C-alpha cells in the first residue's frame, strides 16, 4: 500500500490498461468521521473499498465524484481504488 500520511490532502493515481487496482493505507489516531473523495480525471468506471486492518465501506458514484463518509475508530485502514470498466486517472483525498 501507498501510505497516505495526512488528511485533507490530494493523492494522484492512474489505472490504465492492466493497472486495475491501486492500494493505499492510512492511520486514524482519534475517532471521527472521514470523508473519502475520489475525483475522476477521465470518464471510466472506478470506485473504492475501505476495510480496517483489525465493516467495509464503499464509494458512492456521483458522476465525476466517488465518495462516502464513515466514522472510524483508531487503527489502520486499507483503501483499495479499483476499476470496473475502462481506463483513466483519478485524484484521491481522505478528508477529516
Ligand atoms: Cl486521526
Ligand atoms: Li495506478
Curated annotation (Swiss-Prot):
The conditions that induce or repress this protein are given as:
RNA levels are high in late logarithmic phase.
Q: Could you tell me which residues belong to the region Collagen-binding?
A: 80-84
Record PTM text: Upon purification gives 67 kDa, 78 kDa, 82 kDa and 116 kDa (full-length) proteins all of which have the same N-terminus; only the longest form digests insoluble collagen.
Q: List locations, semicolon-separated.
A: Secreted
Positions of the record's site feature: Collagen binding? 49, 58
Region of interest: S3b collagen-binding domain: 1-96
**Which residues does Ca(2+) 5 bind?**
14, 19, 22
Q: Which domain of life is it from?
A: Bacteria
Q: What is the effect of changing residue 82 to F?
A: S3b fragment has 12-fold decreased affinity for collagen
Q: Which residues bind Ca(2+) 6?
A: 19, 21-22
Biotechnology comment: Widely used for tissue dissociation due to their potent activity on connective tissue. A mix of ColG and ColH is used for isolation of pancreatic islet cells for subsequent transplantation.
Other comment: Clostridial collagenases enable the bacteria to infiltrate and colonize host tissue, and contribute to gas gangrene (myonecrosis) pathogenesis.
Q: What is known of its domains?
A: The mature protein has 4 domains; a metalloprotease domain (S1, approximately residues 111-786), S2 (877-882, equivalent to PKD), and 2 collagen-binding domains (CBD) S3a (997-1003) and S3b (1008-1118). The S1 domain has collagen hydrolytic activity. The metalloprotease S1 domain is composed of 3 subdomains which together resemble a saddle; an activator domain (residues 119-388), the catalytic peptidase subdomain (398-670) and a helper subdomain (679-790) joined by a Gly-rich hinge (387-397). The S2 domain (799-880, PKD) is flexible within a larger structure (S1 plus S2, residues 119-880).
Tell me, in a sentence or two, what this protein's role is. Answer: Clostridial collagenases are among the most efficient degraders of eukaryotic collagen known; saprophytes use collagen as a carbon source while pathogens additionally digest collagen to aid in host colonization. Has both tripeptidylcarboxypeptidase on Gly-X-Y and endopeptidase activities; the endopeptidase cuts within the triple helix region of collagen while tripeptidylcarboxypeptidase successively digests the exposed ends, thus clostridial collagenases can digest large sections of collagen.
Record-stated family: Belongs to the peptidase M9B family. Collagenase subfamily.
Provide the protein name: Collagenase ColG
Q: Which organism's genome codes for this protein?
A: Hathewaya histolytica
Amino acid at each position: 500500500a501507498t501510505v497516505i500520511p495526512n488528511f485533507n490532502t490530494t493523492m494522484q493515481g492512474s489505472l490504465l490498461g492492466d493497472d486495475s487496482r491501486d492500494y493505499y493505507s492510512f492511520e486514524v489516531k482519534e475517532e471521527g468521521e472521514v470523508n473519502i473523495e475520489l475525483d475522476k480525471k477521465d470518464e471510466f468506471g472506478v470506485t473504492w473499498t475501505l476495510h480496517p486492518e483489525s465493516r467495509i465501506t464503499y464509494g458512492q458514484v456521483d458522476g465525476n465524484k466517488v465518495s462516502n463518509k464513515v466514522k472510524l475508530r483508531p487503527g489502520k485502514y486499507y483503501l483499495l481504488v479499483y476499476k470496473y470498466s475502462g481506463s483513466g486517472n483519478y485524484e484521491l483525498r481522505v478528508n477529516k
